[PDB]
Symmetry: D3
């Protein structure tokens, strides 16, 4: 438990006299993840990663970041909304939320935000361009935690898009109590009938009811806690460096 | 302890996919300073914990199975609160968009009954519910503040107890003692309006936190105890369990 | 007829050289009231109450208030929209209206507004919160006219929620020509089949099509003009006092 | 007082057993009208015309029309918003209002609506077009009451755009108690400095602050009740004829 | 080809060192025009007229105007949206477009815009009113090109509302290669069955599915390039004159 | 000029009796492109490529596609909005436009759409997600034309992000009349001061006012028409294939 950098457990007494340089907003989804992983995986993983990166930036450079509570409202695909307790969030709803967050942070004096997404269906570039014009003095960056470091050499499964080896391993590391690997299905996935879409000539969202069986995309069976521990270490290190640099530099000098 | 059957925050598809759910409970909170000593997420944490307890009671007692959704941390706040660090004011339209998206999804999934259990008195859902009643005429949405299910009067000593006070502190001490250090609390001294009729409640204006409060609390929380909190939530939990069961077993009118 | 404090009958020549301290916005509904009361009851009653309070405030303290034209756009319940000429107004529509009113009044130099509602279906706290941030120097209060003084002990009917003894008495007092009590039905109402909702553990809107027969909720038969006269006197006095204090004090001092 | 065709005075008891063929929606503004005319002129005038026309159609044809309460929310020009108690309504606010009105009337089974406007600043064609796709079985027509019959030859003043001889004469006829013509300014107006805008090659809204003194456009001096009575007789007959034809014919046959 | 005044062919190099006085936005529609005219007629015609007008203003007075690319998003009528490739634009969508265009132009330092519409179903008065409050130092004017000079006098056909003799003649002048007059139908149109709507007591949009056979409204078959040339000459001169006056005068002086 | 597959030149008479299988929506931007390339480069290029692919699909397989007029409304970066005649479009405005296009196309019976973007600032995945739930029977795919084929071996310049060698070459091929290579600047660009943003640990938009001098990103000076001609051949062939597969297969089979 870290009240200095994790708002989810913090209180005003602990934060009111401290200077904060960068705000971190974990952004996930309420989404089924194969049969074995939590509905809130895309919130929990970026939150725990962000807190660790915040701890490193503080101990390493004295840069203090606050990790906000994660946003559980993700954008989903055809076939997912019909699965129980999967919440599809319209883009405009997500934008309204980010607007309200940035408005408040701005009033509070903050000027640097990183959105750390745990859901690949979330896209923030358009929202960020629009807010760049409303709040010209407020820097907003965006990343998916799972794109900071390539999974090559860290995991065996070749297909690993959702609730696969990487997500399961990272969950096993941070919260082994939240996942029983023995409960996982194989995460078999089916391609489109339009070859050009499989060749990525153009993009169409995967339909979950046609493309998946257990809601996972990728076999998680070789996942371990140790694999998760090893993978997140360079992720945390690179994110901490970004927080430090966002704190220490203007965007252009 | 961890309950994947009724607490979506810890649950997974494997546990939920072969079970029948009757009622959905949406805890709706705020990200909001609570004096110096309570968590920023107090208004999310408390209704989540109450609702899970009531879900567990309804299940063991009647076989009525409810799902408690993840708490919504987007509250509507007052003047002077937005400037406090990490407090997030949410516009009513933003909240309505959220509830629209939740209801749309739950409706596609086959669900037809939802209770919004609020932890924050600044949240108001009657307009959203009226508007959604016309869009989804087969979908029942109720709303309650957890702290209005049973009056705190009798259960606590402090007479002023509106925000981060004795009652909220006690219930946090009960459910999450590790999250609250009572020794860190301020007195929660509050200042009334200079317009008497507003103090008398002839009309309503929002309290300005910057003018009205010193430590962001409204009410002295210092006689708070875990046991006071435990005793107060017992009847709240039992009444909510009863509402869950009757929502599951009856239509609104018969 | 009072052109000084009632915009419904006023003109620019009467008002242009006067100072106004508080603006009053009566907000009602276009809504069936049992068989006997006007569709515009919820506009008419706060308008007349407001004008009398404004007159009292001026005579007694020299505080001059303008009563704006009533908003006939109320928020209604399931079953009411199907009744002829009942106009359900969405919350967003209502918010748009109040934004336009506040924006104009602000440009005109006004900084003090009371919304005096005649329809309990209307809720303004959310709107007021959001406008507080948009216009921080603009004070907006809201009240239902019928909550200023409790009707318990002014009226005999136990149930009296809509077009019952209280509303009818007050209409009989202000506009006896618009109400014929002989035409009223009993206003019988049915409760919910979910006991916890009648006990008010939680809130669900009453469904008019299941809960009412004639659109009324409460028996109006014991209504008299004299009861209405007696009931509005302290409401008007209390509101006049509010206006005076709003004109004469800052929100905090 | 006519509870049959005027909702502003009507009740559910008088309306509930009767068939209504056309709904008429008076749509005005809250707007200063020189020094002499009511703020609510643009609501009062279409309301009274429409009621008289509805009474004519009913007595001569048995076609029954309901005249809804006037919408006091108009679209205004630069300079008007700063005049006390003028309320500028955004187009989107107006459209939200009509959508709510039409959605309610539609559920009630009504299929034919006339928006009878009293304010030239109001434009409903875009709203009507959009609602024709949402409710293809719902006929919406719009008219300005003051364009049903040209004022040429009914009034003396050449410039007569706002709070001028025609509107004043029509108010003198319907509500002589609400207007004292001796209080009027000359309603002097200044043109643009861009000649082609005065020639109407292109449209720009008139700025009230630059172009008017007393808020009127056109001298009302020669207004009389006689002139008002004479002008409205053919307007009322034309509108009664339209109500009858909307009632008895499909748009196309 | 004119890179000085036509953005559709221009590049930053050509424009970056020149002073621009007025911005011209052609606004059209994607709409069937009888059998023979282009879908983009309403974009092409005002574009070509604006460019010629800008060229005349430049040569004659040294006033330099930029003609923006045409907006192909018009507001359409019942029965048109079912015709292949006709795109109906909601009023709110058009307003969002104009807001974005104005916000960008304002930031660039421009303060004068003319919207030149090619489609009668487009209405900008409301948008202009709302924007005058948001951008008080930004003059926006609007005109339909075909209303700058009345076509009566210049053309034979009695009816000429859409894709008729005037539009066909003007297209044959500017782009003879895009129109084969031999393919045109007669553009026969049916009136309403409600007499008063044909007489224009009130407005209802024409229903294209009931009212037209070939999608045209007006017989175009006497159209000629010479007639089109003749008609655009005085339109081009009047518009050039408006651009020069807009550039050289404040709205009021 | 091909009226069969290019709506910008087509007319109802040519299309009304033909079966169309897939709709192609070119989506561009109004944006400075170094000194030498047109402001409409991002509209013109995907338009011309789409028309060629539509011709190939028809000649080769009998699959008939309509290329809609290009949408000139792009999402832009800080620094771009201040450049003359650059029009930044908010995400919500873009989505309102796509909502309108799809609504119309759906009414007309079409069930398949490819958005072919010319501007990398445009992002359609969110809009497409939200529309999949609104119109579950309507397939929407998105592609950037410049991502269909890698530039490796086709062009020399290493940096080529905007108005560089590839775009300049492709414009020289399709419209040599619209580009003078001799006018081009070097398209020099500058990185961020935040090293982790240059390493792509997270995303922030480039600020044009700090990162470019001439508005281009990439040296265009080795561009040729023959390089453009060679490059678009496989782009056209792959897109033709996608159009055919879209016409002939369900998304999943
Ligand atoms: Ca399946
Ligand atoms: Ca680093
Ligand atoms: Ca009970
Ligand atoms: Ca008092
Ligand atoms: Ca001239
Ligand atoms: Ca620079
Ligand atoms: Ca292929
Ligand atoms: Cl689904
Ligand atoms: Cl996908
Ligand atoms: Cl409050
Ligand atoms: Cl209720
Ligand atoms: Cl005007
Ligand atoms: Cl029309
Ligand atoms: Cl970028
Ligand atoms: Zn995930
Ligand atoms: Zn995910
Ligand atoms: Zn609280
Ligand atoms: Zn709270
Ligand atoms: Zn009432
Ligand atoms: Zn009411
Ligand atoms: Zn008027
Ligand atoms: Zn007016
Ligand atoms: Zn046309
Ligand atoms: Zn047109
Ligand atoms: Zn480009
Ligand atoms: Zn581009």
């Amino acid at each position: 438990m870290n009240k200095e950098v994790d708002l989810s457990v913090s209180c005003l007494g602990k934060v009111k006299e401290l200077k904060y340089d960068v705000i971190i907003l974990p952004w996930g989804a309420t989404e089924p993840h194969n049969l074995h992983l939590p509905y809130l995986t895309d919130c929990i993983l970026p939150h725990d990663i962000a807190v660790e990166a915040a701890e490193l930036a503080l101990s390493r450079s004295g840069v203090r970041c606050m990790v906000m509570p994660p946003v559980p409202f993700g954008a989903h695909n055809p076939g997912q909304r019909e699965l129980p307790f999967c919440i599809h969030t319209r883009y405009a709803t997500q934008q309204a939320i980010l607007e309200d967050i940035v408005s408040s942070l701005h009033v509070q004096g903050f000027r640097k935000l990183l959105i750390l997404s745990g859901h690949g269906g979330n896209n923030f570039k358009g929202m960020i361009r629009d807010l760049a014009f409303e709040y010209p003095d407020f820097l907003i960056a965006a990343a998916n935690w799972f794109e900071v470091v390539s999974p090559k050499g860290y995991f065996e499964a070749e297909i690993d898009d959702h609730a696969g080896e990487s997500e399961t391993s990272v969950m096993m590391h941070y919260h082994p109590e939240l996942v029983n690997l023995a409960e996982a299905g194989d995460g078999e996935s089916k391609p489109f009938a339009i070859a050009s879409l499989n060749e990525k000539v153009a993009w169409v969202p995967r339909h979950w009811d046609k493309a998946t069986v257990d809601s996972g995309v990728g076999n998680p069976k070789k996942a371990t806690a140790e694999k998760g521990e090893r993978y997140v270490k360079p992720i945390v290190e690179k994110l901490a460096g970004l927080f430090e640099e966002m704190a220490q530099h203007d965007l252009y000098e």
